[PDB]
Paper text:
The minimal factors required for [name] targeting at Pol III genes are the [name] subunits, [name] and [name], whereas TFIIIC is essential for directionality of integration, which occurs in a narrow window of 2–3 base pairs (bp) upstream the transcriptional start site (TSS). Two “inner subunits” harbour the two active sites, placing in close juxtaposition the reactive LTR ends with the target DNA and are each associated with an outer subunit.
Following a process of hierarchical classification, we obtained a cryo-EM reconstruction of the [name] intasome engaged with [name] and the target DNA at an overall resolution of 4.0 Å. Analysis of the structure reveals that a phosphodiester bond. has been formed between the 3’-end of the LTR reactive strands and a cleaved 5’-end on the target DNA, confirming the activity of the assembled complex and suggesting that the majority of the particles imaged by cryo-EM correspond to a strand-transfer complex. The integration reaction takes place at position −6 (relative to the TSS) of the non-template strand and position −2 (relative to the TSS) of the template strand, which would result in a 5 bp target site duplication (TSD) after a final step of DNA synthesis. Interaction of [name] with the [name] intasome is mainly mediated by the C-terminal region of an outer [name] integrase subunit, which stablishes a novel set of contacts with the convex surface of [name] stirrups and [name] cyclin repeats. Topologically, this [name]-[name] interface overlaps with the binding interface of [name] and the RNA Pol II-specific transcription regulator negative cofactor 2 (NC2)49. The binding of [name] far upstream (−15 to −32 bp) the TSS constrains the positioning of [name] intasome active site also upstream of the TSS, ensuring that RNA Pol III-transcribed genes are not disrupted by the integration event. The structural data unveils how a newly discovered chromodomain in [name] integrase mediates histone-independent interactions with [name] and the downstream part of the target DNA, acting as a “ruler” that safeguards the integration upstream of the transcription start site and prevents gene disruption.
Author numbering:
A (entry chain A): 17 to 197, 201 to 437
B (entry chain B): 151 to 384, 389 to 437, 440 to 504
C (entry chain D): 17 to 139, 148 to 200, 203 to 327, 331 to 363
Write the structure that this text describes.
DNA sequence: GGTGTTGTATTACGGGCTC
DNA sequence: GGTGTTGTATTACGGGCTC
DNA sequence: TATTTGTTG
DNA sequence: GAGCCCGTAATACAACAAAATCCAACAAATA
C-alpha cells in the first residue's frame, strides 16, 4: 500500500517535465504560475530533473505533485507513518532527505500554522507576543497611583498580616499600608493613606477581589477615579508597586532578618528609606520628584545652592514646573529605553476585529487550578472588541468566567484552513 | 559532562510527578536516556510500587537487560540516595554521581527528554483519565524514530543501525537497511560511533558558546568561607532565608564545593556554585573565646543561629564581631541565662 | 615534499592558533567570523591545542588550513591515492580520526552535493530481502508456573530468528486480551516484524493486531497457524522451558520474577555452541557484564546485598549447566 | 570522580540573474 | 478607556599621557 | 516497634 | 593605530511576579 503509483499530467511540474517530453500540455486553472516557473527555468540553467519510468524526481529527491502535497505532509507529520507532530526542522529532516518540494520550508511552516493540534499543544515562547507599549507616563503630581500587595507574610502579633503599597506613577513615593489579609474597610485605610495627599485620577492595579470589588468600583466611578484593572495572572501592568515590593522585600529582609514577627515597626523606616534613596529611571530622590524637602539633609548635594525649599513661599510654582518638566522628559527617556531593550524580540500582534483566537490554559482556567501533563485543548474562542493595543476581549463560552480580558501573552491566534 | 562511551556506558535518569492517576500510577515517569545514542527509554510506574527495594530494581534490570551501563547521573531523590541503591550499584561497578541539592541541570539530557516527552504526552493524552497507559510505548516508538537536531540522525538508528519497519530509506545509500549478515556490523557501527562522537563535540561546543557569554566562573580554595543562600532550611519571605558562612572541605569540581553547612547531620553536604557565593571578612572586631568561663559571660553578644546538633546537646550559633564560620559551642549551662526569646524566632 | 610543508598565515585557524602567539593577524575580507571565533575560544573551555615548532594540532588530530580544503577532499575522496568514491560514512571514518577539521561532516556532505561523477542511477524505493534483523519473530505459550503470590503463573517466550535473540518474561496464563498487545508493544523496542510465525495453537487474536496495524503504518500480519517444519528450531523451543524450570527450582517467594532479566542477560551472554557469538555483541558493541566486584560484604555501608549477588552467581552457574547439557545433548543426539 | 541540553520558528549565507 | 518596570554588577565612552 | 522528624525530586 | 589611567555614565539582565501545605520516602532519637 505505497504511494506514487499514479500518473498526473495536470499539475505545476508539467511545464518542468515537458522540457524533455514536449508532448502534452494539459494545464489547469491558475496554472499560469507554471508558465512563469518554466520561463524562469528557461532563462536559467538548473536542469537536474530526472525522468525515469514515471518516477520524475530531483537530483536525489522525489518531487511530489501538488495534488497530494497535504497527504504527504500529513503522512510525515501525523502518526500514519510515525511522524509525531513536530516542528518544521524535524519535518524537513523527515521529508527533505526524500523529497524536494520547491519552497518546502514555507509550505511546512504553513502546515504548522494549519495543523490544529500543533496550534493547541505547542507553546513556542508564548511570553513574547506583543510589544511593550507601556503606560502613559504621567500628569501633575499624585494623579496616577499603582496598587497591589503580597498576600501573606509570617504573621506578627495577631493584628497585622500583610503589606499593601501605594506608589504614584510619577514620583514613586513609598507607602506603608499594613493590612490584615482586607474587608470592605479597605476604603477606610486606603482613604486615610492616599487622602493624606489627595484623590488620584486612575488606579493601575490587578483584578483583585479587594479591588474588582463592585462596592469599591462604584465609589471610584462616583468620585471620578478610573481603574486600569490588569487582567488575570498578568501582574506586569501594576509595575511601580511590583518593583517597589521587589525593593521593599530586600529592605524588609534587611531590617527584619533577626527581627521577624514585629516588622510593622520597621515598615515606616522601609518606606522612608525607599523615599530618601534616589532611583535610576529618574535620577532623583522621590522627595525631590515631589516637593523637594529631604528633611534629613546629612550633606548638601552637588551644585550647591540654597537647597532650602522651606524659605521659598510663593515661588514654588516655577520650581514644581521645572521639576515636572525634567521628570517628564526623564520618564519619556525611561519609556524609550525600556522599549529599546525589551522589543528586540517582541513580535507584535495586531488583529482588533473578527478572529478566532485561543487562550492556552492560563487566565482561562483558575490560577489555583493545577497545571500538569493534562492535555491543552482549549477550544477556538472568538474576539469581538479591541479593548487595548496589547489585549483583546473574548466571548468566554462558560457561565461568566468573571472576566473576559486577556493580555496578548496568552492568545496564540488560531488560524483555520479550508 | 564527559562526552560519550561505548553505547550508553554513561546514562542519566530522573523523575517528574504530577501525572493524573489511571491505576494509582501517579509517577509513571522513570525516564532512562541512553546518553550516547539518546535512545531515551521511559517506563510506566508509580510512587507506591517500590522505594528502590523490591520492584524498582526489577524493571530497572528489564531495561538493563538490553545492556548494563557503567555510569549513572541522577538527582538527590530519596529513591536513589538510599544505602540499598548505592551499595548495589557499587557491587555492579556502576557509579552514582548524584545531583547537588536541587540542581537538576546535572540530569539535563533526561530532563530535556522529559521536555520533549511532555509535548508528545499532551499530544497523545486526549483520554487523560480513562485509558492511556498504552500511549507511553507509542510515544517511545515515535520519539526514538524521529531525527534529532544535535546529531542529524534519529536516536533509533544511531544505536541499532537500521531504522524501524516500513522503510523510507533516504538518498544517502542502502546502508540504513543494514538488516543482513552481522560479522561486518562492528566496522560501520564504529564508524557511526565516530560520526555521533563528532556530533557530540559539536554539541558541547555549541552549548558552551551561547551560555558562557555572560557566566563568570567562581574560584575558591579549600579553607575560605562561602555562603549557601538556599537549601539550608526548608514562611520564608521576610525572615533571613540566607544563612551564614561555612568552611569548604572538598573541591570536587571548579563548580562543586563540599562544605560544612551543619555539624554532621544529614543529606550530602555538597552544594553547586549556583547557590554558593563568596564571603569576605575584611575588617573593632572582638577575639576568639577559648576558656571555659568566656563562654558564659560572652553569650549576650550573639548575632544569628544555625540550630541544634542532632547527635548530642550542643547549640551552634553566630556571635558578634568574631570569626563567623569558626563558631563557639554553647551548651545548656550557658543557654538559659541569656534571653532566648529572640533566638528561636529566626529558627521558626 | 608532502602536505603541511607550506606557510599559510591567512585562514580561519589563524585566530585559533594566535591564542598564545598573538603576533600577526593578516585576515581577509569578511573575516569578522574568525575574530568572533577567537573571542569564542577566549570565553569558552576548549583550549587543548599544542604549540610546538609550527605543528599546531588538537589532542590527537592535526588541524588543516582552510585553503587546501579542496586538495584534502580530492586526496581523500577521489582515486588519486587509491580511493573509490565511497559514502560519507566510510569517508568520515577515514578522515576524522587523523585530522580535526572544524565543520568536517558538513564539508564532506557539501562536497558530495557539489560533485558530479558519482551521481548516477543508483536504485529501488525500499530494500528487498527475505533475511533481516528483528523483521520476523515467533512466540509460544507455557503453562506450569507458580502463582508467585501475584497470579503471575506464565512465561512469555519471544524468539528473534533473524538474530537468535530471546525475550522471556512473566505473565498470567489466564489472560496473556488487550493486555497481551500492550506488553507486546512495550516489548517492541526494536520495531515491528514482517510476519509472526508463532505456530503454537489456534489463535483468535491477529484481528485486533490487524486493527492496530491499520491504526499504524506497518503491515505486520500474524500468520503461520498449524504449520510443521521441525528442523532444529523445535529443539530450541523444547529446551527453552528447561531454563525456566531451572529458574523455578530456585525458589517460589521472591522467585524468578525477581532477577529474571538477569537470567535473560546471562542467558544470551554466551556464544551459541561457538558457531555464533552472543546476541549482545552480535548487534551492539558488547553490552558489558561487569561482575568483577562481588565479595565486599564486610560492612556494606540476606535479602538486600548478599543473597542478590549469590543469586546472580547461582544463575550464572545454572546457565553454564544448561549450556553444558545442551552441548552434550547435541553431541549424543547427532 | 559529580554537574546542562535539544525543539523550534526565525533568520543568515552561497548558486544563478539582472546588472 | 486597561495592560511592565526599576536595582544591580558589569561594561562602554570621553579628558589627559605616552606616543 | 510505632511514632516522630531532619532533608529532597 | 595602541595602550593606559580615571571618571563618569550608560546597559542588558534578572527580580516583583500569591503563600505555604505536604507526597513518598530515605535515615537518626528516644523510650
Amino acid at each position: 500500500s505505497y504511494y506514487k503509483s499514479d500518473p498526473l499530467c495536470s499539475a505545476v511540474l508539467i511545464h518542468m517535465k515537458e522540457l524533455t517530453q514536449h508532448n502534452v500540455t494539459p494545464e489547469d486553472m491558475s496554472a499560469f504560475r507554471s508558465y512563469q516557473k518554466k520561463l524562469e527555468l528557461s532563462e536559467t540553467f538548473r536542469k537536474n530533473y530526472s525522468l525515469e519510468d514515471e518516477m520524475i524526481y530531483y537530483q536525489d529527491r522525489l518531487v511530489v505533485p501538488i495534488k497530494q502535497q497535504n497527504a504527504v505532509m500529513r503522512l510525515y507529520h501525523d502518526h500514519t507513518l510515525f511522524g509525531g507532530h513536530f516542528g518544521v526542522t524535524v519535518t524537513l529532516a523527515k521529508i527533505s532527505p526524500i523529497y524536494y518540494w520547491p519552497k518546502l520550508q514555507h509550505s511546512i511552516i504553513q502546515y504548522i500554522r494549519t495543523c490544529v493540534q500543533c496550534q493547541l499543544i505547542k507553546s513556542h515562547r508564548p511570553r513574547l507576543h506583543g510589544l511593550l507599549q507601556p503606560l502613559p507616563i504621567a500628569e501633575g503630581r499624585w494623579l496616577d497611583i499603582s496598587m497591589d500587595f503580597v498576600t501573606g507574610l509570617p504573621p506578627t502579633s495577631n493584628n497585622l498580616n500583610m503589606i499593601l503599597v501605594v506608589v504614584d506613577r510619577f514620583s514613586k513615593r513609598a507607602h506603608f499600608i499594613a493590612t490584615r489579609k482586607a474587608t470592605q474597610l479597605i476604603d477606610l485605610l486606603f482613604r486615610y493613606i492616599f487622602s493624606y495627599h489627595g484623590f488620584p485620577r486612575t488606579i493601575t492595579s490587578d483584578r483583585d477581589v479587594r479591588m474588582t470589588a463592585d462596592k469599591y468600583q462604584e465609589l471610584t466611578k462616583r468620585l471620578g477615579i478610573k481603574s486600569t484593572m490588569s487582567s488575570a495572572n498578568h501582574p506586569q501592568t501594576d509595575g511601580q508597586s511590583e518593583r517597589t515590593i521587589q525593593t521593599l522585600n530586600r529592605l524588609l529582609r534587611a531590617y527584619a532578618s533577626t527581627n521577624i514577627q514585629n516588622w510593622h515597626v520597621y515598615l515606616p523606616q522601609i518606606e522612608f528609606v525607599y523615599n530618601s534613596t534616589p532611583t535610576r529611571t529618574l535620577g532623583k530622590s522621590p522627595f525631590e520628584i515631589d516637593l523637594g524637602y529631604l528633611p534629613n539633609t546629612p550633606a548638601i548635594k552637588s551644585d550647591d545652592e540654597v537647597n532650602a525649599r522651606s524659605f521659598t513661599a510663593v515661588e514654588l510654582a516655577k520650581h514644581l514646573k521645572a521639576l515636572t518638566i525634567q521628570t517628564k522628559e526623564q520618564l519619556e527617556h525611561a519609556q524609550i529605553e525600556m522599549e529599546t531593550n525589551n522589543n528586540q524580540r517582541r513580535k507584535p500582534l495586531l488583529l482588533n476585529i473578527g478572529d478566532h483566537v485561543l487562550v492556552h490554559r492560563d487566565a482561562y482556567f483558575k490560577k489555583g487550578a493545577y497545571m500538569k501533563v493534562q492535555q491543552i485543548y482549549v477550544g477556538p474562542f472568538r474576539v469581538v472588541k479591541k479593548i487595548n493595543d496589547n489585549a483583546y476581549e473574548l466571548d468566554l463560552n462558560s457561565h461568566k468566567k468573571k472576566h473576559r480580558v486577556i493580555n496578548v501573552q496568552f492568545l496564540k491566534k488560531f488560524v483555520y484552513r479550508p | 559532562l564527559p562526552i560519550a562511551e561505548g553505547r550508553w556506558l554513561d546514562i542519566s535518569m530522573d523523575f517528574v510527578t504530577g501525572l493524573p492517576p489511571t491505576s494509582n500510577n501517579l509517577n509513571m515517569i522513570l525516564v532512562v536516556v541512553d546518553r550516547f545514542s539518546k535512545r531515551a527509554h521511559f517506563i510506566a510506574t508509580r510512587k507506591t510500587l517500590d522505594a528502590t527495594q523490591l520492584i524498582d530494581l526489577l524493571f530497572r534490570y528489564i531495561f538493563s537487560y538490553h545492556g548494563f551501563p557503567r555510569t549513572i547521573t541522577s538527582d538527590r531523590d530519596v529513591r536513589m540516595t538510599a544505602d540499598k541503591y548505592q551499595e548495589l550499584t557499587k557491587r555492579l561497578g556502576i557509579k552514582s554521581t548524584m545531583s547537588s541539592a536541587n540542581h537538576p541541570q546535572t540530569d539535563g539530557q533526561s530532563e530535556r527528554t522529559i521536555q520533549t516527552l511532555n509535548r508528545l504526552l499532551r499530544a497523545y493524552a486526549s483520554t487523560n483519565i480513562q485509558n492511556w497507559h498504552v500511549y507511553l510505548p507509542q510515544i517511545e516508538f515515535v520519539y526514538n524514530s524521529t531525527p534529532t537536531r544535535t546529531l542529524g540522525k534519529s536516536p533509533f538508528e544511531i544505536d541499532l543501525g537500521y531504522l524501524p519497519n516500513t522503510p523510507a530509506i533516504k538518498s544517502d545509500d542502502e546502508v540504513n537497511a543494514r538488516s543482513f549478515t552481522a560479522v561486518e556490523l562492528a566496522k560501520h557501527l564504529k564508524a557511526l560511533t565516530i560520526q555521533t562522537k563528532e556530533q557530540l563535540e559539536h554539541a558541547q561546543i555549541e552549548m558552551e558558546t551561547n551560555n558562557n557569554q555572560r557566566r563568570k566562573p567562581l574560584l575558591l580554595n579549600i579553607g575560605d568561607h562561602v555562603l549557601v543562600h538556599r537549601d539550608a532550611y526548608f514562611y520564608m519571605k521576610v525572615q533571613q532565608i540566607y544563612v551564614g558562612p561555612f568552611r569548604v572541605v572538598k573541591k570536587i569540581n571548579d563548580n562543586a564545593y563540599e562544605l560544612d553547612l551543619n555539624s554532621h547531620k544529614k543529606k550530602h553536604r555538597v552544594i553547586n556554585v549556583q547557590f554558593l557565593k563568596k564571603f569576605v571578612y575584611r575588617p573593632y572586631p572582638k577575639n576568639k573565646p577559648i576558656s571555659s568561663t568566656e563562654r558564659i559571660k560572652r553569650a549576650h553578644e550573639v548575632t544569628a543561629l544555625i540550630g541544634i546538633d542532632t547527635t548530642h546537646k550542643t547549640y551552634l550559633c553566630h556571635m558578634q564581631d568574631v570569626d563567623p564560620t569558626l563558631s563557639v559551642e554553647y551548651s545548656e549551662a550557658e543557654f538559659c541565662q541569656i534571653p532566648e526569646r529572640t533566638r528561636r524566632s529566626i529558627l521558626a
